[PDB]
Ligand binder design. Structure first.
Ligand SMILES: CN1CCN(C(=O)N2Cc3c(n[nH]c3NC(=O)c3cccc(Oc4ccccc4)c3)C2(C)C)[C@@H](Cc2ccccc2)C1
Length: 292
């Protein structure tokens, strides 16, 4: 797919018109894997939203970007970040999405230690989203703390579907090497046909993040960690004894090398560990703006 076929295809699935017609005061707040993030205001209502501006000339696999807009444009789930509109502006894809005040889980796991009630709440939210997604044949493929956002009141939402893929009866598996090194499933690194189960492994790594503050082999270069993940026995927790038997049991069902033996999102939703989940209000204290 050439650059022009890409822009054209993109132009075909994005909203027509210029967002500058109803969006004001754009203000950069950060950036991502291939662009920047800004906050803006909807003219008519004064409602604040977040805008993801992506550089089309920096997309490694531009097919994946197309998949993100097509598959998730109208997606609606309480634990999934909502996309309002998308626009093709020159050589940039602008995606207008909801603004989540709580930030990403990354900032939390790297500056504080969550209790088990907070961890269960996060796992539960992510698992509710994945169970619905997986049932529809949608695989996220980039589960990690960075992909998890929080609302001001503590609700958990899955975002960053930039690496997502679709499977079906006709095409039950994918083989693309995608995701983030430290969180990649061993079967995916091995380049073996894989399915939704890879999200479950990545989630397990995110659990290690919540307990330890970082994923396994985080002290190793990405390509080296990938080799270790693919060839070594499942990773272990540094703060092993600081977690309960319930959390350890839960984790053991996530980090199973053989995907056929790994638990599924649906099965995990009934695991005793998630019964400890606290309400959204328990997540609030974790946010940077509220941490001491
Ligand atoms: C690694 N990814 C995380 C998700 N991002 C998003 O796509 N975001 C972030 C975001 C959104 N809505 N509301 C927020 N809130 C904050 O970002 C948000 C809110 C409050 C606090 C905060 O952190 C902070 C943490 C420490 C210090 C200061 C701030 C972040 C959307 C547009 C969905 C990705 C962007 C992207 C991807 C690809 C290409 C270009 C851009 C990057």
């Amino acid at each position: 797919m050439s650059h022009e076929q890409f822009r054209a295809a993109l132009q075909l699935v994005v909203d027509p018109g210029d967002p500058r017609s109803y969006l004001d005061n754009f203000i950069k707040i950060g950036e991502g894997s291939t662009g920047i993030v800004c906050i803006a205001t909807v003219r008519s209502s004064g409602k604040l939203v977040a805008v993801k501006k992506m550089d089309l000339r920096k997309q490694q696999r531009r097919e994946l970007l197309f998949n993100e807009v097509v598959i998730m444009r109208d997606y609606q789930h309480e634990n999934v970040v909502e996309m309002y509109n998308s626009y093709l502006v020159g050589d940039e894809l602008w995606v207008v999405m909801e603004f989540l005040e709580g930030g990403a889980l990354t900032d939390i796991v790297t500056h504080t230690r969550m209790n088990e009630e907070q961890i269960a709440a996060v796992c539960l939210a992510v698992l509710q989203a994945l169970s619905v997604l997986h049932a529809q044949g949608v695989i996220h493929r980039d589960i990690k703390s960075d992909s998890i956002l929080l609302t001001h009141d503590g609700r958990v939402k899955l975002s960053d579907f930039g690496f997502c893929a679709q499977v079906s009866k006709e095409v039950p598996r994918r083989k693309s090497l995608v995701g983030t090194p430290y969180w990649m499933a061993p079967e995916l690194i091995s380049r073996l046909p894989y399915g939704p189960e890879v999200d479950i492994w990545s989630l397990g790594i995110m659990v290690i993040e919540m307990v330890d503050g970082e994923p396994p082999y985080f002290n190793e270069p990405p390509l080296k960690a990938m080799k270790m993940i693919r060839d070594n026995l499942p990773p272990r927790l540094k703060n092993l004894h600081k977690v309960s038997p319930s959390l350890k049991g839960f984790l053991d069902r996530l980090l199973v090398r053989d995907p056929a033996q790994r638990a599924t999102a649906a099965e995990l939703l009934k695991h005793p560990f998630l019964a400890k989940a606290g309400p959204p209000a328990s997540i609030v204290p974790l946010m940077r703006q509220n941490r001491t």
